[PDB]
């Protein structure tokens, strides 16, 4: 029988990490040769060794028969052990848990305290999709019991059963139903958290659940009245826990009502001036209390002190406190965006912080914040942060700055100038789903492509080892040959397209070492497109097209193979099938 | 004695050579 | 061509660095830990590393990675050759390698480190000649070095000139599964400990199956190594020009030839497993070995390694000749042997059972290998002929050497 | 502690100052900023003691670059140093001299290097060398105007072997930092002298000596075969590296050696048992072994077509050893040792490393696709992976089964059947796609083609390019040859890649698909379903040119990369 | 509610974990291996919070030992530093003067304590007397 | 060592 506390000793002699693992292994060896035999006297210690093992990631397929018939013993230690094993190393998809069906069930009706509130706790963490529904009833029946410490036991099930299980919430609501009286702070607590989760599943019960209202109101201010109790006052606020779920509760109880609002307007304004956010708790409660407000129908006052209030939390130093009030100003966007503008300035810093969390609440706040009249102005501040951003940022900031110029963009030749200068600078940072979208909304624009396919053949044989912007360059060439290169057919003066540049570029492209498949394939598709779309480089593609046909990926060389078929015996029906394709939203 | 086979004398040269 | 030899830890402290060119920052190690522990989590971790322009080549030590950071395209086969002579010199003075030994000799080990190699070119390799110039516990450099021969210091004088040959036989089969050898390669080893006064310039002499077919006596039992390497006292224009083995032996234990053939005779030890494992529910180990050698010689401290399951616990075994006993850390079955007699047949019958729950991922076959070393037995059939010990000053030597052969890469495929 | 450690340093006892400056070393070596008691230790500096010399030395050569306006208080003691009686104390010295990065400690340092050029003493000589190596590297305008390559290029032609070695040895590292003006060539008296004092030299003045004649061209035949002769003795060495040495000369001199002659079946006889041994080397030098074989393969092949066991992976063979193993035998397969390779592919396919079990496939494919004769067996092997349940196995399986049939499809029609249903619910997009490609191409013997693509078609428009791409011309194949089971099936791909599909190239290639079926559909069997050419596969052999400047560059970092030198340096 | 609750050392060694959320073995290693990385990669002005997978990913260590909570966004963050805080003095009143040397020893009776306070994520006890005698009379039963 | 030192100092 070797003691967790002796385990633990070797475990730290041991300084090899091979050598560690060769005394995991003689330890996982005597326990199972000790749990082979049956053993029952040392199991508490052979149960300790294994979770140690495992938490120090050690194997312990082998040690699960021994937690189940631990569970089913009648020691308080053995109990335990069989809990602790059941609760760590099993699982839903474990598949164990469901001869543990029937211990839970007999340990449900167990006269001891400490043995249902460990089975209840352990069928609260696994909680099975099978397990509650051989147990929803076994739930229901000690949520009407009246011990208090049993209670909130009973509450958590209930609700991890409606979260694993939500078509099991109708057999609840007339459990907790008149349980708003509750003297002890966990039962009300078990019991707002049930009522929460109950109203956050169906919007069914937010009707029934909007009723007690008043009752809510009462409890919250008769616990901002009682500031001072020796249980649950942390750094000066009493039931911090409780508060909060207050505010959360009338936060989205009433969210799309006005009696609801204005029945809680009143402890709202009383908790938002009668509540110092000195320490963390306090500044937790009143940064709970304004999203309550914001995501409520609020009156104009509320609102307004809830916008103060975030400017002041902004300006403080602390990190937590920074990322607490960039959340706020983030979940506040839709909502009191006019109040949001004025601090333009603060969101603008925000991206320079020195902080990760800090920097990317700033950028997605400004790019929440990005107007149709700001969009202009913010361009430079968001291709500044893209040119200077963090390698996790680049790709960000440029998919941020797109979505905004696909969205609110000021003009279509301003949008494609900055859509332009991002996959010029975002280099392998844009994103290729991002690609598809951008060839759609090029295709949509039939305004501005010969400027447009002027700067896609500039920007394509400067260089061609950006995915993206090479597959959007090849799609411009194919999309717009016939105006990237005006009098291209034979030799003219010396200009920017000479209708041969083009099928060099795509030549190389195709040939090239950085070539995913992707973009060979959209250039060999421009390519074919081009001899229909150019009549200046014919007769000269087809035998490019007929080398390639013998590639070595399938699809390119079945791709070059209908090319030269094309080219061919289908000269005269090439530009029968090589319509512009339809442009759609 | 020695485990992994006991010393033995070695001559100076193959006498059979010349 | 490294910029700088420096000696690692196991948590990454480097226990000590030595700069030789001064083109590598020494803050370059810092980053090889991380590379390092990147590479293993992924599997691309190598011995050489490369920190951009830098590449930071390191050696897993006995407790420190020898790493050595280098910046040009320097000789790959130089910087291991230097690192090996560094740690062989490094075993030679120190008896233990480990970070006990690293803080507690550092005055003189700098001084070794600073006369080893100057400007990434290695001077001093010789742990002799070394130690006579660096000690622990200084003069003129030995003219030793200065002089040809760097490997037999003049002027030792000893009571007697005895030397203690050993005729070290690796014998590596490769077994595949199906039952058939694949590798079946002997590599000999001629280690010879001189210890006699002066420096002798040993005239090594055996039966060669080269030699022979040339002096016309290719009809006898003659060895012929595929792969023989001469040691560094030994002259190879001789071996090149009439397989002369002409070489001044050295002061101590040192390595003169190491023949290297393939072998197409059978194994020494036919060993045939047995895997009876049930469905969860029992394992079977029918594992019966057969003695292909002598029976003449005798295996001397034979361990043949099952592998049993990584789950398996509860085992009963049934054997016959020799105890076998189960190693939890190894995760297998050594079936051991005090002495077995050439010709031995040693049948086994393992028995243990399975955990109900089946193993989430795969542990693989790893291979079963025997550690079977009978001595005085000479598989090969090379029979040294003489050792021309002849010096200036005139002396009769009394030359010893025994034979020794042992298994090596002798390892079954498992079914 | 420093201010302690400053008085006894600043004490005229010598075991207070020997204790001092122990502790200092210590401090220096368990991470502690000791250079700001360098000026401190420069007044107890000329000490008697070889030992504090030592000490004092090494912490004014770290804290040097720290403090270089301190070290200009040492010019004077080393130039005291230099014509110390004790040859050990001159090495030390020179060796400091050479060590110290400052630019203005070299200049006053050039008398020093200039009188110990000429030591007399070979570790002084080799000393003196390797600090004139030093400035050079440091300076180069120093060195040429001090004038130190002559007296380089004379220390080859003088004795101490080993000290001539460091010359040659110093005399290439100042050439190949050189922009190859004034080269330290020598004429063939040159090489024969080196040759001579290759025998006397020692394990790393071998390899300096070896290295000379690796930029060396040898012009004759006769030259060559003496060059030939005078390094086969240094296979026979028990040094790794100079052996690797010796081996890259006689590839190098083989450039211009003739084939008709028998001095190059000779050296090739002599340089597999050579190639042997190098391969039962260290783990760190295995790699290095097999980069080197495998960079040679490509110029000699014929050299090892007999080396097949060896290139087995041993059991406790590291990953990388493994992979090297894997790449050799994947260039040295034939078909010789097919059933080797196969039977070493299929034991090696029951590894637990998915990496290594995804090189054995790879390795097993390319053995089959070179070699049309183990076509059979590597469709065999194929089957059997895939029906030992492993989902990388099944991956690797259907990707090589894939790339079969667009190289040999000819005799791949008896494995549609077994491949029809073979677990095909996999989600790897190499597989999917590979056997979307099968299906499609080879869709005649299978009677259950269409169904078997309906199910895939369930998520066409958000699968992925690639695999939509497969599957609308696996869809379009179908249609051409049996449309009469897949008429309603093309037209909703069509319908599905037209309006459904946002990507361009698939929008692109959907609408060509549309218009053809529109246009004629007689005719796309002739321009959609024709037969395709034979498929060029990528050749692995490296391009003669860059073959023959790595067979030169042996040894180096470059050969183990397998980069150009000039690709991999900084 | 809290997905996952870990308690690792500053060295990487982890002396405690709670996960809510049930995953798979090698995705769970996967999963705290890279929560020991960035937090291990984090300076000490990063704000303690990290959005890691949409997961409010705070980290708050008063000592060597280091402790991370993953939450829905759903909740404010100071919350859970609170809660943190709360559950930190409950288990230094439990054992008294908590060292990492006792944690790793009492590995059993801190799970036990975390069982009795949070389950599932949410928060069981809101008081901190309460809480305390219950374990103690846990304890006592034997 | 740091590791005996308190969670919370008090």
Same mark, same amino acid.
């Given at each position: 029988?070797?003691?967790?506390?002796?385990?633990?000793?070797?475990?730290?002699?041991?300084?090899?990490?091979?050598?560690?693992?060769?005394?995991?292994?003689?330890?996982?060896?005597?326990?199972?040769?000790?749990?082979?035999?049956?053993?029952?006297?040392?199991?508490?210690? &052979?149960?300790?060794?294994?979770?140690?093992?495992?938490?120090?990631?050690?194997?312990?397929?082998?040690?699960?028969?021994?937690?189940?018939?631990?569970?089913?013993?009648?020691?308080?230690?053995?109990?335990?052990?069989?809990?602790?094993?059941?609760?760590?190393?099993?699982?839903?998809?474990?598949?164990?848990?469901?001869?543990?069906?029937?211990?839970?069930?007999?340990?449900?009706?167990?006269?001891?305290?400490?043995?249902?509130?460990?089975?209840?706790?352990?069928?609260?963490?696994?909680?099975?999709?099978?397990?509650?529904?051989?147990?929803?009833?076994?739930? $229901?029946?000690?949520?009407?019991?009246?011990?208090?410490?049993?209670?909130?036991?009973?509450?958590?099930?209930?609700?991890?059963?409606?979260?694993?299980?939500?078509?099991?919430?109708?057999?609840?609501?007339?459990?907790?139903?008149?349980?708003?009286?509750?003297?002890?702070?966990?039962?009300?607590?078990?019991?707002?958290?049930?009522?929460?989760?109950?109203?956050?599943?169906?919007?069914?019960?937010?009707?029934?659940?909007?009723?007690?209202?008043?009752?809510?109101?009462?409890?919250?201010?008769?616990?901002?009245?009682?500031?001072?109790?020796?249980?649950?006052?942390?750094?000066?606020?009493?039931?911090?826990?409780?508060?909060?779920?207050?505010?959360?509760?009338?936060?989205?109880?009433?969210?799309?009502?006005?009696?609801?609002?204005?029945?809680?307007?009143?402890?709202?304004?009383?908790?938002?001036?009668?509540?110092?956010?000195?320490?963390?708790?306090?500044?937790?409660?009143?940064?709970?209390?304004?999203?309550?407000?914001?995501?409520?129908?609020?009156?104009?006052?509320?609102?307004?002190?809830?916008?103060?209030?975030?400017?002041?939390?902004?300006?403080?130093?602390?990190?937590?406190?920074?990322?607490?009030?960039?959340?706020?100003?983030?979940?506040?966007?839709?909502?009191?965006?006019?109040?949001?503008?004025?601090?333009?300035?603060?969101?603008?810093?925000?991206?320079?912080?020195?902080?990760?969390?800090?920097?990317?609440?700033?950028?997605?706040?400004?790019?929440? @914040?990005?107007?149709?009249?700001?969009?202009?102005?913010?361009?430079?501040?968001?291709?500044?942060?893209?040119?200077?951003?963090?390698?996790?940022?680049?790709?960000?900031?440029?998919?941020?700055?797109?979505?905004?110029?696909?969205?609110?963009?000021?003009?279509?030749?301003?949008?494609?100038?900055?859509?332009?200068?991002?996959?010029?600078?975002?280099?392998?940072?844009?994103?290729?789903?991002?690609?598809?979208?951008?060839?759609?909304?090029?295709?949509?624009?039939?305004?501005?492509?010969?400027?447009?396919?002027?700067?896609?053949?500039?920007?394509?044989?400067?260089?061609?080892?950006?995915?993206?912007?090479?597959?959007?360059?090849?799609?411009?060439?194919?999309?717009?040959?016939?105006?990237?290169?005006?009098?291209?057919?034979?030799?003219?003066?010396?200009?920017?397209?000479?209708?041969?540049?083009?099928?060099?570029?795509?030549?190389?492209?195709?040939?090239?070492?950085?070539?995913?498949?992707?973009?060979?394939?959209?250039?060999?598709?421009?390519?074919?497109?081009?001899?229909?779309?150019?009549?200046?480089?014919?007769?000269?593609?087809?035998?490019?097209?007929?080398?390639?046909?013998?590639?070595?990926?399938?699809?390119?060389?079945?791709?070059?193979?209908?090319?030269?078929?094309?080219?061919?015996?289908?000269?005269?029906?090439?530009?029968?099938?090589?319509?512009?394709?339809?442009?759609?939203? | 004695?020695?485990?992994?086979?006991?010393?033995?004398?070695?001559?100076?040269?193959?006498?059979?050579?010349? | 061509?490294?910029?700088?030899?420096?000696?690692?830890?196991?948590?990454?402290?480097?226990?000590?660095?030595?700069?030789?060119?001064?083109?590598?920052?020494?803050?370059?190690?810092?980053?090889?830990?991380?590379?390092?522990?990147?590479?293993?989590?992924?599997?691309?971790?190598?011995?050489?590393?490369?920190?951009?322009?830098?590449?930071?080549?390191?050696?897993?030590?006995?407790?420190?990675?020898?790493?050595?950071?280098?910046?040009?395209?320097?000789?790959?086969?130089?910087?291991?050759?230097?690192?090996?002579?560094?740690?062989?010199?490094?075993?030679?003075?120190?008896?233990?390698?480990?970070?006990?030994?690293?803080?507690?000799?550092?005055?003189?080990?700098?001084?070794?480190?600073?006369?080893?190699?100057?400007?990434?070119?290695?001077?001093?390799?010789?742990?002799?000649?070394?130690?006579?110039?660096?000690?622990?516990?200084?003069?003129?450099?030995?003219?030793?070095?200065? &002089?040809?021969?760097?490997?037999?210091?003049?002027?030792?004088?000893?009571?007697?000139?005895?030397?203690?040959?050993?005729?070290?036989?690796?014998?590596?089969?490769?077994?595949?599964?199906?039952?058939?050898?694949?590798?079946?390669?002997?590599?000999?080893?001629?280690?010879?400990?001189?210890?006699?006064?002066?420096?002798?310039?040993?005239?090594?002499?055996?039966?060669?199956?080269?030699?022979?077919?040339?002096?016309?006596?290719?009809?006898?039992?003659?060895?012929?190594?595929?792969?023989?390497?001469?040691?560094?006292?030994?002259?190879?224009?001789?071996?090149?020009?009439?397989?002369?083995?002409?070489?001044?032996?050295?002061?101590?234990?040192?390595?003169?030839?190491?023949?290297?053939?393939?072998?197409?005779?059978?194994?020494?030890?036919?060993?045939?497993?047995?895997?009876?494992?049930?469905?969860?529910?029992?394992?079977?180990?029918?594992?019966?070995?057969?003695?292909?050698?002598?029976?003449?010689?005798?295996?001397?401290?034979?361990?043949?390694?099952?592998?049993?399951?990584?789950?398996?616990?509860?085992?009963?075994?049934?054997?016959?000749?020799?105890?076998?006993?189960?190693?939890?850390?190894?995760?297998?079955?050594?079936?051991?042997?005090?002495?077995?007699?050439?010709?031995?047949?040693?049948?086994?019958?393992?028995?243990?059972?399975?955990?109900?729950?089946?193993?989430?991922?795969?542990?693989?076959?790893?291979?079963?290998?025997?550690?079977?070393?009978?001595?005085?037995?000479?598989?090969?059939?090379?029979?040294?002929?003489?050792?021309?010990?002849?010096? #200036?000053?005139?002396?009769?030597?009394?030359?010893?050497?025994?034979?020794?052969?042992?298994?090596?890469?002798?390892?079954?495929?498992?079914? | 502690? %420093?201010?302690?450690?400053?008085?006894?340093?600043?004490?005229?006892?010598?075991?207070?100052?020997?204790?001092?400056?122990?502790?200092?070393?210590?401090?220096?070596?368990?991470?502690?900023?000791?250079?700001?008691?360098?000026?401190?230790?420069?007044?107890?500096?000329?000490?008697?003691?070889?030992?504090?010399?030592?000490?004092?030395?090494?912490?004014?050569?770290?804290?040097?670059?720290?403090?270089?306006?301190?070290?200009?208080?040492?010019?004077?003691?080393?130039?005291?140093?230099?014509?110390?009686?004790?040859?050990?104390?001159?090495?030390?010295?020179?060796?400091?001299?050479?060590?110290?990065?400052?630019?203005?400690?070299?200049?006053?340092?050039?008398?020093?290097?200039?009188?110990?050029?000429?030591?007399?003493?070979?570790?002084?000589?080799?000393?003196?060398?390797?600090?004139?190596?030093?400035?050079?590297?440091?300076?180069?305008?120093?060195?040429?105007?001090?004038?130190?390559?002559?007296?380089?290029?004379?220390?080859?032609?003088?004795?101490?072997?080993?000290?001539?070695?460091?010359?040659?040895?110093?005399?290439?590292?100042?050439?190949?930092?050189?922009?190859?003006? &004034?080269?330290?060539?020598?004429?063939?008296?040159?090489?024969?002298?080196?040759?001579?004092?290759?025998?006397?030299?020692?394990?790393?003045?071998?390899?300096?000596?070896?290295?000379?004649?690796?930029?060396?061209?040898?012009?004759?035949?006769?030259?060559?075969?003496?060059?030939?002769?005078?390094?086969?003795?240094?296979?026979?060495?028990?040094?790794?590296?100079?052996?690797?040495?010796?081996?890259?000369?006689?590839?190098?001199?083989?450039?211009?050696?003739?084939?008709?002659?028998?001095?190059?079946?000779?050296?090739?006889?002599? @340089?597999?048992?050579?190639?042997?041994?190098?391969?039962?080397?260290?783990?760190?030098?295995?790699?290095?072994?097999?980069?080197?074989?495998?960079?040679?393969?490509?110029?000699?092949?014929?050299?090892?077509?007999?080396?097949?066991?060896?290139?087995?992976?041993?059991?406790?063979?590291?990953?990388?050893?493994?992979?090297?193993?894997?790449?050799?035998?994947?260039?040295?397969?034939?078909?010789?040792?097919?059933?080797?390779?196969?039977? $070493?592919?299929?034991?090696?396919?029951?590894?637990?490393?998915?990496?290594?079990?995804?090189?054995?496939?790879?390795?097993?494919?390319?053995?089959?696709?070179?070699?049309?004769?183990?076509?059979?067996?590597?469709?065999?092997?194929?089957?059997?992976?895939?029906?030992?349940?492993?989902?990388?196995?099944?991956?690797?399986?259907?990707?090589?089964?894939?790339?079969?049939?667009?190289?040999?499809?000819?005799?791949?029609?008896?494995?549609?059947?077994?491949?029809?249903?073979?677990?095909?619910?996999?989600?790897?997009?190499?597989?999917?796609?590979?056997?979307?490609?099968?299906?499609?191409?080879?869709?005649?013997?299978?009677?259950?083609?269409?169904?078997?693509?309906?199910?895939?078609?369930?998520?066409?428009?958000?699968?992925?390019?690639?695999?939509?791409?497969?599957?609308?011309?696996?869809?379009?194949?179908?249609? @051409?040859?049996?449309?009469?089971?897949?008429?309603?099936?093309?037209?909703?791909?069509?319908?599905?890649?037209?309006?459904?599909?946002?990507?361009?190239?698939?929008?692109?290639?959907?609408?060509?698909?549309?218009?053809?079926?529109?246009?004629?559909?007689?005719?796309?069997?002739?321009?959609?379903?024709?037969?395709?050419?034979? %498929?060029?596969?990528?050749?692995?052999?490296?391009?003669?040119?860059?073959?023959?400047?790595?067979?030169?560059?042996?040894?180096?970092?470059?050969?183990?990369?397998?980069?150009?030198?000039?690709?991999?340096?900084? | 509610?809290?997905?996952?609750?870990?308690?690792?050392?500053?060295?990487?060694?982890?002396?405690?974990?709670?996960?809510?959320?049930?995953?798979?073995?090698?995705?769970?290693?996967?999963?705290?291996?890279?929560?020991?990385?960035?937090?291990?990669?984090?300076?000490?002005?990063?704000?303690?919070?990290?959005?890691?997978?949409?997961?409010?990913?705070?980290?708050?260590?008063?000592?060597?030992?280091?402790?991370?909570?993953?939450?829905?966004?759903?909740?404010?963050?100071?919350?859970?530093?609170?809660?943190?805080?709360?559950?930190?003095?409950?288990?230094?009143?439990?054992?008294?003067?908590?060292?990492?040397?006792?944690?790793?020893?009492?590995?059993? #009776?801190?799970?036990?304590?975390?069982?009795?306070?949070?389950?599932?994520?949410?928060?069981?006890?809101?008081?901190?007397?309460?809480?305390?005698?219950?374990?103690?009379?846990?304890?006592?039963?034997? | 060592?740091?590791?005996?030192?308190?969670?919370?100092?008090?």
């Amino acid at each position: 029988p070797i003691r967790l506390r002796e385990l633990i000793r070797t475990i730290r002699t041991a300084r090899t990490q091979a050598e560690e693992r060769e005394m995991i292994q003689k330890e996982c060896a005597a326990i199972r040769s000790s749990f082979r035999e049956e053993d029952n006297t040392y199991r508490c210690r &052979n149960v300790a060794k294994l979770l140690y093992m495992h938490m120090l990631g050690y194997p312990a397929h082998f040690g699960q028969l021994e937690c189940l018939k631990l569970i089913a013993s009648q020691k308080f230690t053995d109990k335990r052990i069989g809990y602790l094993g059941a609760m760590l190393l099993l699982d839903e998809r474990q598949d164990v848990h469901l001869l543990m069906t029937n211990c839970i069930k007999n340990d449900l009706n167990h006269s001891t305290q400490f043995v249902q509130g460990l089975a209840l706790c352990t069928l609260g963490c696994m909680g099975s999709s099978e397990m509650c529904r051989d147990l929803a009833g076994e739930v $229901e029946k000690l949520l009407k019991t009246s011990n208090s410490y049993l209670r909130k036991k009973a509450a958590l099930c209930a609700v991890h059963v409606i979260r694993k299980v939500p078509e099991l919430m109708e057999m609840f609501l007339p459990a907790t139903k008149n349980l708003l009286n509750e003297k002890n702070h966990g039962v009300l607590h078990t019991s707002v958290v049930l009522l929460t989760e109950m109203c956050e599943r169906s919007p069914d019960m937010l009707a029934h659940f909007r009723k007690l209202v008043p009752q809510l109101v009462r409890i919250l201010k008769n616990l901002i009245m009682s500031g001072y109790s020796p249980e649950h006052d942390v750094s000066g606020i009493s039931d911090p826990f409780l508060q909060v779920r207050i505010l959360r509760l009338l936060r989205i109880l009433g969210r799309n009502d006005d009696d609801s609002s204005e029945a809680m307007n009143d402890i709202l304004a009383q908790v938002a001036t009668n509540t110092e956010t000195s320490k963390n708790v306090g500044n937790a409660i009143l940064y709970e209390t304004v999203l309550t407000i914001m995501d409520i129908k609020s009156e104009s006052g509320l609102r307004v002190l809830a916008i103060n209030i975030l400017g002041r939390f902004l300006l403080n130093n602390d990190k937590n406190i920074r990322y607490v009030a960039l959340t706020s100003l983030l979940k506040t966007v839709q909502t009191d965006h006019n109040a949001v503008q004025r601090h333009r300035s603060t969101i603008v810093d925000c991206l320079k912080d020195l902080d990760v969390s800090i920097k990317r609440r700033a950028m997605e706040l400004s790019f929440a @914040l990005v107007n149709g009249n700001n969009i202009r102005g913010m361009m430079k501040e968001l291709l500044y942060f893209l040119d200077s951003c963090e390698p996790e940022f680049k790709a960000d900031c440029a998919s941020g700055i797109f979505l905004a110029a696909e969205k609110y963009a000021p003009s279509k030749r301003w949008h494609i100038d900055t859509i332009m200068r991002v996959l010029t600078t975002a280099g392998s940072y844009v994103r290729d789903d991002a690609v598809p979208n951008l060839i759609q909304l090029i295709t949509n624009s039939v305004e501005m492509h010969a400027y447009t396919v002027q700067r896609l053949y500039k920007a394509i044989l400067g260089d061609y080892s950006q995915q993206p912007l090479v597959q959007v360059a090849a799609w411009c060439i194919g999309e717009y040959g016939d105006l990237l290169v005006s009098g291209q057919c034979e030799e003219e003066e010396p200009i920017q397209v000479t209708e041969d540049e083009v099928l060099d570029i795509l030549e190389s492209v195709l040939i090239s070492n950085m070539s995913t498949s992707v973009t060979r394939g959209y250039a060999l598709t421009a390519i074919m497109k081009l001899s229909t779309r150019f009549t200046c480089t014919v007769n000269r593609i087809k035998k490019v097209v007929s080398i390639y046909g013998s590639s070595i990926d399938v699809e390119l060389q079945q791709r070059a193979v209908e090319y030269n078929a094309l080219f061919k015996k289908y000269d005269h029906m090439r530009s029968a099938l090589l319509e512009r394709m339809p442009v759609m939203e | 004695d020695r485990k992994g086979g006991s010393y033995s004398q070695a001559a100076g040269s193959d006498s059979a050579q010349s | 061509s490294a910029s700088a030899v420096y000696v690692l830890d196991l948590k990454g402290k480097v226990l000590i660095c030595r700069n030789y060119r001064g083109d590598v920052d020494m803050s370059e190690v810092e980053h090889f830990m991380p590379i390092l522990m990147e590479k293993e989590e992924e599997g691309m971790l190598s011995p050489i590393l490369a920190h951009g322009g830098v590449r930071f080549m390191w050696i897993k030590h006995n407790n420190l990675y020898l790493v050595a950071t280098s910046k040009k395209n320097a000789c790959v086969s130089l910087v291991f050759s230097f690192l090996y002579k560094v740690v062989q010199v490094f075993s030679e003075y120190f008896k233990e390698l480990e970070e006990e030994s690293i803080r507690d000799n550092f005055v003189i080990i700098y001084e070794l480190l600073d006369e080893l190699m100057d400007f990434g070119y290695p001077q001093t390799t010789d742990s002799k000649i070394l130690q006579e110039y660096i000690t622990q516990e200084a003069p003129r450099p030995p003219a030793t070095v200065t &002089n040809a021969v760097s490997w037999r210091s003049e002027g030792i004088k000893y009571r007697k000139n005895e030397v203690f040959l050993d005729v070290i036989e690796a014998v590596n089969l490769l077994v595949s599964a199906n039952g058939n050898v694949l590798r079946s390669e002997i590599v000999g080893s001629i280690k010879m400990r001189v210890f006699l006064s002066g420096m002798p310039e040993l005239r090594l002499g055996l039966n060669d199956k080269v030699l022979f077919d040339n002096t016309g006596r290719g009809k006898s039992k003659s060895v012929e190594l595929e792969d023989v390497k001469f040691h560094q006292c030994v002259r190879l224009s001789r071996f090149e020009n009439d397989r002369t083995i002409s070489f001044i032996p050295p002061d101590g234990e040192f390595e003169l030839m190491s023949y290297r053939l393939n072998t197409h005779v059978k194994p020494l030890i036919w060993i045939e497993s047995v895997i009876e494992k049930h469905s969860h529910s029992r394992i079977e180990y029918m594992v019966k070995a057969k003695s292909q050698f002598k029976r003449r010689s005798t295996a001397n401290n034979v361990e043949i390694h099952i592998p049993v399951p990584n789950d398996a616990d509860s085992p009963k075994f049934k054997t016959t000749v020799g105890s076998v006993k189960w190693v939890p850390e190894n995760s297998e079955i050594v079936w051991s042997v005090k002495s077995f007699p050439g010709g031995k047949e040693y049948l086994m019958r393992a028995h243990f059972g399975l955990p109900s729950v089946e193993a989430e991922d795969k542990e693989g076959k790893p291979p079963i290998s025997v550690k079977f070393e009978i001595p005085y037995f000479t598989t090969s059939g090379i029979q040294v002929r003489y050792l021309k010990i002849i010096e #200036k000053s005139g002396y009769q030597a009394l030359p010893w050497v025994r034979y020794i052969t042992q298994n090596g890469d002798y390892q079954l495929r498992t079914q | 502690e %420093i201010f302690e450690l400053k008085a006894e340093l600043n004490s005229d006892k010598k075991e207070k100052k020997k204790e001092a400056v122990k502790k200092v070393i210590a401090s220096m070596t368990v991470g502690k900023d000791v250079s700001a008691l360098f000026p401190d230790v420069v007044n107890c500096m000329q000490t008697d003691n070889l030992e504090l010399k030592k000490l004092v030395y090494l912490y004014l050569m770290n804290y040097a670059k720290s403090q270089p306006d301190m070290a200009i208080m040492a010019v004077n003691t080393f130039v005291k140093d230099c014509e110390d009686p004790n040859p050990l104390i001159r090495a030390l010295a020179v060796r400091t001299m050479g060590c110290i990065r400052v630019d203005k400690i070299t200049e006053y340092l050039c008398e020093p290097l200039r009188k110990c050029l000429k030591d007399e003493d070979p570790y002084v000589r080799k000393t003196a060398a390797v600090c004139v190596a030093k400035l050079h590297d440091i300076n180069a305008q120093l060195v040429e105007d001090q004038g130190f390559l002559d007296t380089l290029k004379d220390l080859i032609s003088d004795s101490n072997p080993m000290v001539v070695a460091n010359a040659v040895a110093a005399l290439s590292e100042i050439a190949e930092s050189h922009p190859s003006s &004034n080269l330290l060539d020598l004429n063939p008296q040159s090489i024969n002298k080196l040759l001579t004092a290759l025998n006397e030299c020692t394990e790393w003045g071998q390899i300096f000596i070896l290295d000379c004649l690796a930029n060396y061209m040898p012009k004759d035949d006769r030259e060559a075969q003496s060059i030939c002769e005078r390094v086969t003795p240094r296979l026979s060495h028990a040094n790794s590296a100079v052996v690797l040495s010796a081996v890259k000369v006689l590839m190098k001199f083989m450039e211009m050696l003739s084939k008709d002659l028998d001095y190059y079946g000779t050296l090739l006889k002599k @340089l597999a048992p050579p190639l042997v041994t190098l391969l039962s080397a260290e783990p760190e030098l295995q790699y290095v072994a097999l980069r080197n074989i495998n960079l040679i393969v490509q110029k000699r092949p014929e050299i090892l077509k007999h080396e097949m066991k060896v290139f087995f992976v041993k059991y406790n063979d590291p990953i990388y050893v493994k992979l090297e193993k894997l790449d050799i035998m994947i260039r040295l397969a034939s078909q010789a040792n097919i059933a080797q390779v196969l039977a $070493e592919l299929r034991e090696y396919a029951t590894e637990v490393d998915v990496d290594f079990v995804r090189k054995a496939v790879r390795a097993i494919g390319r053995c089959a696709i070179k070699v049309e004769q183990s076509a059979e067996r590597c469709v065999s092997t194929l089957l059997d992976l895939i029906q030992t349940k492993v989902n990388y196995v099944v991956q690797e399986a259907i990707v090589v089964i894939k790339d079969i049939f667009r190289k040999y499809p000819n005799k791949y029609e008896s494995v549609i059947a077994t491949l029809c249903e073979n677990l095909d619910s996999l989600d790897e997009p190499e597989a999917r796609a590979a056997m979307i490609w099968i299906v499609g191409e080879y869709a005649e013997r299978i009677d259950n083609a269409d169904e078997l693509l309906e199910s895939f078609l369930e998520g066409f428009h958000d699968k992925s390019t690639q695999v939509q791409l497969q599957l609308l011309t696996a869809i379009v194949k179908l249609f @051409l040859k049996k449309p009469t089971e897949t008429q309603e099936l093309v037209q909703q791909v069509l319908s599905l890649a037209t309006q459904d599909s946002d990507n361009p190239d698939l929008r692109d290639r959907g609408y060509i698909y549309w218009r053809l079926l529109s246009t004629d559909p007689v005719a796309a069997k002739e321009v959609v379903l024709a037969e395709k050419p034979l %498929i060029s596969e990528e050749t692995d052999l490296i391009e003669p040119t860059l073959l023959d400047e790595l067979i030169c560059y042996i040894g180096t970092l470059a050969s183990v990369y397998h980069k150009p030198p000039s690709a991999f340096v900084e | 509610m809290i997905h996952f609750i870990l308690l690792f050392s500053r060295q990487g060694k982890l002396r405690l974990q709670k996960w809510y959320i049930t995953l798979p073995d090698k995705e769970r290693k996967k999963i705290t291996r890279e929560i020991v990385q960035i937090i291990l990669s984090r300076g000490h002005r990063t704000s303690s919070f990290v959005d890691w997978k949409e997961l409010k990913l705070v980290y708050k260590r008063y000592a060597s030992l280091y402790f991370c909570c993953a939450i829905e966004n759903q909740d404010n963050e100071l919350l859970t530093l609170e809660i943190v805080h709360r559950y930190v003095e409950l288990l230094d009143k439990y054992f008294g003067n908590v060292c990492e040397l006792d944690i790793i020893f009492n590995f059993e #009776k801190a799970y036990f304590i975390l069982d009795e306070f949070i389950i599932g994520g949410e928060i069981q006890e809101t008081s901190k007397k309460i809480a305390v005698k219950a374990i103690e009379d846990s304890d006592m039963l034997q | 060592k740091g590791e005996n030192t308190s969670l919370l100092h008090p």
